[PDB]
Design a protein around this ligand. Structure first.
Ligand SMILES: [Mg+2]
Ligand SMILES: [Mg+2]
Ligand SMILES: [Mg+2]
Ligand SMILES: [Mg+2]
Ligand SMILES: [Mg+2]
Ligand SMILES: [Mg+2]
Ligand SMILES: [Mg+2]
Ligand SMILES: [Mg+2]
Ligand SMILES: [Mg+2]
Ligand SMILES: [Mg+2]
Ligand SMILES: [Mg+2]
Ligand SMILES: [Mg+2]
Ligand SMILES: [Mg+2]
Ligand SMILES: [Mg+2]
Ligand SMILES: [Mg+2]
Ligand SMILES: [Mg+2]
Ligand SMILES: [Mg+2]
Ligand SMILES: [Mg+2]
Ligand SMILES: [Mg+2]
Ligand SMILES: [Mg+2]
Ligand SMILES: [Mg+2]
Ligand SMILES: [Mg+2]
Ligand SMILES: [Mg+2]
Ligand SMILES: [Mg+2]
Ligand SMILES: [Mg+2]
Ligand SMILES: [Mg+2]
Ligand SMILES: [Mg+2]
Ligand SMILES: [Mg+2]
Ligand SMILES: [Mg+2]
Ligand SMILES: [Mg+2]
Ligand SMILES: [Mg+2]
Ligand SMILES: [Mg+2]
Ligand SMILES: [Mg+2]
Ligand SMILES: [Mg+2]
Ligand SMILES: [Mg+2]
Ligand SMILES: [Mg+2]
Ligand SMILES: [Mg+2]
Ligand SMILES: [Mg+2]
Ligand SMILES: [Mg+2]
Ligand SMILES: [Mg+2]
Ligand SMILES: [Mg+2]
Ligand SMILES: [Mg+2]
Ligand SMILES: [Mg+2]
Ligand SMILES: [Mg+2]
Ligand SMILES: [Mg+2]
Ligand SMILES: [Mg+2]
Ligand SMILES: [Mg+2]
Ligand SMILES: [Zn+2]
Lengths: 50, 114, 69, 120, 91
RNA sequence: AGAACUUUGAAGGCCGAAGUGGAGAAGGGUUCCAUGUGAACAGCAGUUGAACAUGGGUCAGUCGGUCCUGAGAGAUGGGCGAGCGCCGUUCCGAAGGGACGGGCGAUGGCCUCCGUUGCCCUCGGCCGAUCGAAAGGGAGUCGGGUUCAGAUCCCCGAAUCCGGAGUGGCGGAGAUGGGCGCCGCGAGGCGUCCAGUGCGGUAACGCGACCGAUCCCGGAGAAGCCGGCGGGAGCCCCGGGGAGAGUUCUCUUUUCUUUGUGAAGGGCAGGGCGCCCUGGAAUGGGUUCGCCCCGAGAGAGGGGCCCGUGCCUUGGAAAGCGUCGCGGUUCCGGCGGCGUCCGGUGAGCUCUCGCUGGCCCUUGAAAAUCCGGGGGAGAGGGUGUAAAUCUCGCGCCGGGCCGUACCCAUAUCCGCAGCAGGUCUCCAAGGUGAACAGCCUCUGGCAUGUUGGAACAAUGUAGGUAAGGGAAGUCGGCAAGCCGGAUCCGUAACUUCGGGAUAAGGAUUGGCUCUAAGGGCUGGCAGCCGACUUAGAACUGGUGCGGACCAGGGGAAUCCGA
RNA sequence: CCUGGGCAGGGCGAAGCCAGAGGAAACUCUGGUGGAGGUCCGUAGCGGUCCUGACGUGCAAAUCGGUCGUCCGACCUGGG
């Protein structure tokens, strides 16, 4: 029901020892194994939500 | 020429009714039931797909029968990685730790010279 | 069932308790010895009638023996 | 049934009028191609593994068997014999020319040795 | 032998749904059924997954590409603008 | 007592494996079986039945429900509502009553050693109680025999799963080695110290076992559809043998029924690997039906792993089957002999497994359960003495409840009925044949479908013909009838260039002898064994050949809808 | 919506691939392989065009016999 691809981006919880798995909308040109960064001072590349 | 018959009352050709036919010692073709095929475990999330070698590919309720020889490999990350992942993760961990030590001693030289 | 290969292992099974049936089946080329100990059937097959006779001599007499015809 | 099957084995009762299906339904073209090309591709393996064809002409005749050129095993074997008889001449003439050139270069080197001995 | 001269891949449909529509579907069917050169392993094993997803056969590195091609020209323009605004005066 | 109909013998037929056959789900509820009657029922009849009366029949750890969630249904917190109640399923909730470890107090048993109670500290997202599949997921029973009615349930024989073990049932791992000083010829001994939570292979990985707590990660469960190809099984085909039977007017080493190994453990074939080592290619090479693969390592050589439903082995020949003979009135899963064998092949049909490809603005399910790995908090005897643990071989006990008969249908269901109506499934043989088409047979069923006898009038209902004309009948070629299969030629107007097209229009088609072509397996070109296909030639039958059945009449146009 | 089951055989021969020939190049021609499709003939299945046939106080308060359209799918169908 969606033509846009979903991206399964796993994170790391900064508070407890547990890997958190989230579901992002896949931007154009990302690939498996790319370190997707997220936060305020993240550097501006394709995939880095900021 | 001997047309054979079901033995349960599962009258439909579902996935659980996956059968075969054998021959009794009393000279009669019988309709004998078959367990569904179990697949071997695969690796962990990111390598080329392929079943791990040396694990008895059965149902996990049959895995209670199995001893601690036919469910894993004696190597570390044995029944989880196909050992190509092991020989890659060892080298990757070692190289990234050594390069972070190089970056740390470069920052220490920057502290000593600045 | 299981097939015991060694005569010493079969006679150790015969010495072992919780065993209530020893059967002897003669055949046209060999002879089969059956022990129904507990939920398993152990078979020693041997092709020498003299060895069968000396194993019958070395069989412990405290247990019944059924000869199949 | 056995008499009729013996007549079919001899080749009788198999005219044009007693064919009620198409030729692809009777003997499939895909099955004919599979049998034909499996035979024509394992005869080359029996040749290459034993003695006959070398490494390089095997791939050329392999592609030429994959193409629809060689009809059957007999003319495939005849074409392999023709290429072998051509290769024998092409290596015999090359070996004769190489022997003539090698003796000429050896004579030139020995004349260089004679002039070197005359100078020193 | 060249069996079809104009329809190309669209000859699996036949006589239906218009010459202009079949001509406009022809180019993108060639684009979705053509194998693309992988930029990671260097092979040409980019097999088409579902829409938006491309998948190289060797090394299993799945990439999020265009809907019918591997790279949209608009996507290349966006990538050039993003790297330009990246190295423009350090944010 | 009574026979067109009940039962048996025989004959002739039908259903003909997509069944008028053998069993199921829903539904019926005793209809299943035996005995007795025939006023009542069955559209006539009965000695018959699904009618009536009496008496029987359904046995489960390993078949299913019960467990799990799916779409969905749902109560509490909360809100609404005059009100029974309604909205909603994580929202606005103080919505975990559990375990490990430590400390303290008390009780009990043989107070040695252990098990609980009460308190404190520490840890611990439920994607939110609960329901929801007799076709989804879901551990583990198969072989022979038994009744008038049961069958994986009952008897015999042979196995497996899941729970339980406190004074911890028996073995085997962990387990027992090295160094030093002395005695003794020596085997060995004395005393001290130290190690020992298993080993091997370069590897992929293997073994009889291999300390593991909160926590984390991963896999299985857990995947669509359709082509191809290959392996295995079952059935079918052919040749030889063994047992029985049919025909013999003449012939036929002829024809027909049968010719066995279950679950489980081990060994070995066979299939597969995107699994490893040596090794470096180009004059590019290896393989497929198709692809595909190769410096991110091809060919080649040597190894490893998975499935092993295939063969052998314990089961297992003592049963089972065929055939011949012998005793018991009977009761006896009687008694004795022989056999239950050798091979070949497949565009053969069905099932299963595996490789690979195509399709997509379709990506083709969750949960319960179970396993592995990372982590080392802790645990244990400390040395001539044995534990902490065992996912190893055994030994002992238990597995509760519910359903189990029969029809599953042109007569046990629904339609007011023994109604040409309707209802979801598995198994499917021989010939002709492309075919699971149509036709005839075998295994298995049946009496022609709620009646029989006599005659063959009109009209009718279905089927087939008819001299000459061929649509002149009729609103209309309505109905009926011509071509129909296959092979070899040859195919128009138009067009979106794909089609139109099996266009149109011709020839052959039977039987019997031949000829040529299409393969495998051994030896360093020679020899043995089978396949049904194609093409060509002669001869012949009253031009007869798709000889039954199977089965496109065609062409030119107009309007509308792609 | 969820969860299951099913669809005999032949015809046309798309993409991709191989071989040969021509050309300076663009590329073209021929012979194969391939099996694509809301494709064609056709069975089971699903519906019901015509005979305005049979029945029409019927088998039936809508059925039957031929002739039928479609049959890899915008397909048919059980249960919740
Ligand atoms: Mg089930
Ligand atoms: Mg073809
Ligand atoms: Mg008959
Ligand atoms: Mg069928
Ligand atoms: Mg039937
Ligand atoms: Mg009855
Ligand atoms: Mg009576
Ligand atoms: Mg009556
Ligand atoms: Mg009654
Ligand atoms: Mg029992
Ligand atoms: Mg509610
Ligand atoms: Mg309330
Ligand atoms: Mg439930
Ligand atoms: Mg079960
Ligand atoms: Mg019964
Ligand atoms: Mg049984
Ligand atoms: Mg197959
Ligand atoms: Mg076979
Ligand atoms: Mg077995
Ligand atoms: Mg029953
Ligand atoms: Mg009826
Ligand atoms: Mg019916
Ligand atoms: Mg009615
Ligand atoms: Mg047949
Ligand atoms: Mg045939
Ligand atoms: Mg009658
Ligand atoms: Mg009737
Ligand atoms: Mg006339
Ligand atoms: Mg006439
Ligand atoms: Mg005329
Ligand atoms: Mg006229
Ligand atoms: Mg008129
Ligand atoms: Mg007509
Ligand atoms: Mg006529
Ligand atoms: Mg014209
Ligand atoms: Mg036309
Ligand atoms: Mg006009
Ligand atoms: Mg229309
Ligand atoms: Mg179609
Ligand atoms: Mg047409
Ligand atoms: Mg038609
Ligand atoms: Mg009708
Ligand atoms: Mg009418
Ligand atoms: Mg009337
Ligand atoms: Mg039809
Ligand atoms: Mg028709
Ligand atoms: Mg059609
Ligand atoms: Zn790649």
């Amino acid at each position: 029901g969606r033509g846009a691809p979903l991206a399964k981006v796993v994170f790391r919880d900064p508070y407890r020892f547990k890997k958190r798995t989230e579901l992002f909308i896949a931007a154009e040109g990302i690939h498996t194994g790319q370190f997707v960064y997220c936060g305020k001072k993240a550097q501006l590349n394709i995939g880095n939500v900021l | 020429v001997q047309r054979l018959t079901y033995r349960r009352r599962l009258s439909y050709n579902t996935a659980s009714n996956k059968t075969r036919l054998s021959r009794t010692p009393g000279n009669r073709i019988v309709y004998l039931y078959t367990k569904k095929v179990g697949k071997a475990p695969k690796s962990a999330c990111g390598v080329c797909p392929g079943r791990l070698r040396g694990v008895r590919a059965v149902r996990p309720k049959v895995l209670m029968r199995l001893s601690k020889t036919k469910k894993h490999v004696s190597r570390a990350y044995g029944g989880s990685m196909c050992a190509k992942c092991v020989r890659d993760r060892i080298k990757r961990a070692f190289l990234i730790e050594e390069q972070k030590i190089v970056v740390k001693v470069l920052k220490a030289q920057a502290q000593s010279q600045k | 069932p299981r097939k015991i290969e060694e005569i010493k292992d079969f006679l150790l099974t015969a010495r072992r308790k919780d065993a209530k049936s020893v059967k002897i089946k003669k055949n046209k080329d060999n002879v089969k010895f059956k022990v129904r100990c507990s939920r398993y059937l152990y078979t020693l097959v041997i092709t020498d009638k003299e060895k069968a006779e000396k194993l019958k001599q070395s069989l412990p007499p405290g247990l019944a023996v059924k000869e199949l015809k | 049934c056995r008499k009729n099957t013996l007549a079919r084995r001899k080749g009788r009762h198999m005219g044009i009028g007693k064919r009620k299906g198409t030729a692809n339904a009777r003997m499939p073209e895909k099955v004919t191609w599979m049998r034909r090309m499996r035979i024509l591709r394992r005869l080359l393996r029996r040749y290459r593994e034993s003695k006959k064809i070398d490494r390089h002409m095997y791939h050329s005749l392999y592609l030429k068997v994959k193409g629809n050129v060689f009809k059957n095993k007999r003319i495939l074997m005849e074409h392999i014999h023709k290429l072998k008889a051509d290769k024998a001449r092409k290596k015999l003439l090359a070996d004769q020319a190489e022997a003539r050139r090698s003796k000429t270069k050896e004579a030139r080197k020995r004349r260089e040795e004679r002039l070197q001995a005359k100078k020193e | 032998a060249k069996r079809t001269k104009k329809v190309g891949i669209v000859g699996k449909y036949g006589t239906r749904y218009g010459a202009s529509l079949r001509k406009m579907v022809k180019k993108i069917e060639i684009s979705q059924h053509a194998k693309y050169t992988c930029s990671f392993c260097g092979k040409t094993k980019m097999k088409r997954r579902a829409v938006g997803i491309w998948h190289c056969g060797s090394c299993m590195k799945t990439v999020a590409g265009g809907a019918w091609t591997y790279n949209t020209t608009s996507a290349v323009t966006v990538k050039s603008a993003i790297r330009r605004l990246k190295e423009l005066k350090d944010q």
